[PDB]
């Protein structure tokens, strides 16, 4: 009798608002531009599936369209917040070794998980043997870099889809976004860009977790009286 | 259960159909969020094909009218000793200063490049800019 | 009156630079390994320059130095490859230290 009311007031309520967590205020097109999010790889490195997201080529350097980046990022940050609000396990994956330390700190700070190391075969599709029969897999996987260190898609992108785990991913102009659930076209090389992504996803997760605590507390205080 | 056929449909269509068929007893935690706020593209696996024949990529080269001026300035004068500071978002190079002035003199009504180009250089010399020609 | 992305791109300092070959730019040393200096100049990728012998001691993390850019990204396609091989670093020549 009480479970349905609790679920409606807490779990179903946020899903009725377009921007419940107000993630739109975290970034602007100007802030993305100042972080060099629009700078893509050279035209000869272009992936065919990234063409819809490319504004053009400036002297053989692909320029990512930040107007589409903004809409794609809005959806990615919204989805991330709703999952953190729902107490979902979020795993950050990246094989860029320049940012392994930064990403591993960001995960620890927001109370989430990071996998920046060599991805061993079967981590997701054979987890019950690797971790244990009662292991819980991640509910969301955020790829800060979707390519491994031989410029091919990170194996976890395929394995996340096999395990029906939604994926958020920064997809540069040489990446394959076909299997990423919430692709965000943007530069994945410049530290300023990667530092912005980490700030944005860490804030959205922190904001959502606090909102879950506030909403639950109000529901409980009201419940007693 | 779940379907590990990642090349058939998407994670959404597969989950929706299996929950609909009664295979998945409970919807996954993410399902209701996706249904409410779906992505712009449904994540379906596609195979990248090489372009044969006359198929070309629609990506266009980004050019501006002032590139014609910039090209001539760099040919006549070259990159000045002044170093570009790309960290400053409002940095104005000597070339950009020339472009801006050249564009202003065009508003006056000069319709020739040679004369208009020469007049621009003189204005900068009066302002104190150092314009050492390659010659 | 919100600035469009196209407006930002046209006015961006990188756009007005045009071709990068033989363009003198100012970079900052952000990482040092042995004698290798990893310098960021505002592009997509950093460049790696060997510590000059004349005044190696001066070059430290955070020092601003003068570069001559050769290429923003070192890429090339070799026999039988479907895409370019990218080194993920820019090509530049370290001229010296910037002094104001």
């Amino acid at each position: 009798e009480d479970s349905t009311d609790f679920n409606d007031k807490i779990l179903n309520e946020p899903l009725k608002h377009s921007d419940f967590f107000n993630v739109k205020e975290l970034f602007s097109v100007r802030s993305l531009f100042d972080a060099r999010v629009h700078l893509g790889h050279k035209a000869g490195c272009r992936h065919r599936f990234m063409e819809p997201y490319i504004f053009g080529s400036r002297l053989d350097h692909d320029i990512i369209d930040l107007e589409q980046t903004a809409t794609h990022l809005q959806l990615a940050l919204n989805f991330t917040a709703h999952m953190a609000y729902r107490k979902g396990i979020i795993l950050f994956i990246s094989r860029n070794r320049q940012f392994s330390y930064l990403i591993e700190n960001m995960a620890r700070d927001c109370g989430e998980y990071a996998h920046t190391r060599y991805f061993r075969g079967g981590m997701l599709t054979n987890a019950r043997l690797l971790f244990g029969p009662t292991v819980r897999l991640p509910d969301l996987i955020i790829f800060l870099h979707t390519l491994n260190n031989i410029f091919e898609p990170h194996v976890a992108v395929r394995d996340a889809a096999k395990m029906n785990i939604p994926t958020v991913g920064i997809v540069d102009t040489n990446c394959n976004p076909c299997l990423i659930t919430y692709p965000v076209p943007g530069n994945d090389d410049s530290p300023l860009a990667v530092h912005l992504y980490c700030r944005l996803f860490q804030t959205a997760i922190t904001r959502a977790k606090e909102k879950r605590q506030q909403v639950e507390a109000l529901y409980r205080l009201q419940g007693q009286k | 259960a779940g379907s590990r056929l990642e090349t058939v449909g998407s994670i959404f269509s597969r989950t929706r159909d299996l929950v609909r068929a009664g295979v998945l007893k409970e919807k996954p935690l993410w399902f209701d969020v996706y249904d409410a706020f779906p992505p712009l593209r449904e994540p379906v696996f596609q195979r990248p094909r090489v372009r044969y024949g006359k198929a070309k990529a629609p990506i266009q080269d980004i050019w501006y009218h002032e590139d014609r001026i910039r090209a001539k300035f760099y040919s006549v004068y070259g990159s000045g000793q002044r170093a570009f500071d790309l960290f400053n978002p409002n940095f104005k190079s000597t070339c950009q200063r020339f472009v801006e002035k050249y564009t202003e003199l065009q508003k006056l009504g000069e319709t020739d490049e040679e004369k208009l180009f020469v007049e621009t250089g003189k204005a900068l010399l009066a302002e104190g800019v150092i314009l050492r020609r390659v010659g | 009156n919100v600035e469009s992305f196209a407006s930002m791109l046209r006015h961006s300092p990188l756009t007005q630079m045009g071709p990068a070959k033989d363009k003198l730019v100012i970079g900052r040393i952000f990482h040092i390994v042995e004698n290798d200096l990893y310098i960021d100049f505002g592009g997509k990728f950093h460049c790696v320059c060997r510590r000059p012998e004349v005044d190696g001691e001066k070059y430290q993390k955070g020092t601003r130095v003068r570069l001559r850019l050769l290429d923003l990204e070192l890429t090339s396609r070799f026999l039988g490859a479907t895409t370019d091989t990218t080194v993920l670093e820019a090509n530049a020549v370290l001229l010296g230290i910037q002094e104001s």
Binding site: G56 | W63 | A6
Partner: peptide, 26 residues
């Protein structure tokens, strides 16, 4: 509309084609 959109041109920075030392000589 907007005036800052890229226009269609031919590469204005394109360098002239290289010529061999005997180009144009009998």
């Amino acid at each position: 509309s907007n005036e800052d959109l890229p226009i269609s041109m031919e590469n204005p920075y394109k360098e002239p084609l290289k010529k061999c030392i005997l180009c144009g000589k009998h």
